[PDB]
Amino acid sequence: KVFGRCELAAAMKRHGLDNYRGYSLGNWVCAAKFESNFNTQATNRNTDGSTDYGILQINSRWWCNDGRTPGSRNLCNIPCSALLSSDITASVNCAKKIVSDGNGMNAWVAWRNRCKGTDVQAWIRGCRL
C-alpha cells in the first residue's frame, strides 16, 4: 500500500504515535516519507547485510527476523515480512520499541538527516486529524 500523506498521519495518530516519547505526529510522517515514500512494501538492503522493511524501514539487524541477517536479533518478535502489510499496526508497535531504545528518533537515519531541525508540522498541514 502506498499511503497518502494525511491517510498515514491519521493511521499513525490512531495507533498512538502523535507525541509518542515526545515526538509530534509530523516527525513520524516526515520519517516515513523519506524512509519509504509512504510505501508499506518498501525494502532496502543495508551495507552490513541486514535489510530495512516497511513504512518506517525497520532493520533486521535488531528488530525483526528475516532469516538471512547473521548475528541479528528480533527484538520486536516479528517476521520482517509482517512489517510490509497494508495494516501498519506491527510497524507502529515495533517503532515504539525502537524509539524507546535510547537515541529517540535518531535511530532513523533519514529522520536525523532530513527531518530533525525542520518544520515537521508542515507534514501534517491540511490534514483532518
Ligand X SMILES: c1ccc(CCCc2ccccn2)nc1
Assess whether 52 carries a catalytic annotation.
yes
DSSP one-letter code for 58? E
Q: Is 128 helix (H, G, I), strand (E, B) or coil?
A: coil
79-to-24, 88, 107 alpha-carbon distances in Å: 28, 14, 20
Our CB check for ligand X shows the closer of 38 and 129 to be 38
* Grid cell of 103 as nine digits: 537515541
Which one of 7, 18, 52, 87 is the catalytic residue?
A: 52
CB nearer ligand X, residue 14 or residue 73: 73
Binding site for substrate: which residues?
Answer: 101
Binding residues: 101
66 touches ligand X (CB under 6 A): no
Under the criterion CB under 6 A, does residue 127 sit at the interface with ligand X? no
Q: What are phi and psi of 35, to 5 degrees?
A: -85, -50
3-state secondary structure of 33: helix
Q: Which stretch binds ligand X (CB under 6 A): 44-52, 65-73, 75-83, 97-105?
A: 44-52
Compute the distance between CA of residue 106 and CA of residue 114 in angstroms, rounded to an integer: 11
Residue 32 binding ligand X, by CB under 6 A: no
The reply to whether 7 belongs to the active site is no
Cell numbers standing for residue 14: 490512531
Q: Which of 18, 52, 61, 92 binds ligand X (CB under 6 A)?
A: 52
Residues in the chain, total: 129
Site string for ligand X, 92-111 (x = CB under 6 A): -----------------xx-
Point out which residues bind ligand X (CB under 6 A): 34-35, 44, 46, 52, 57, 109-110
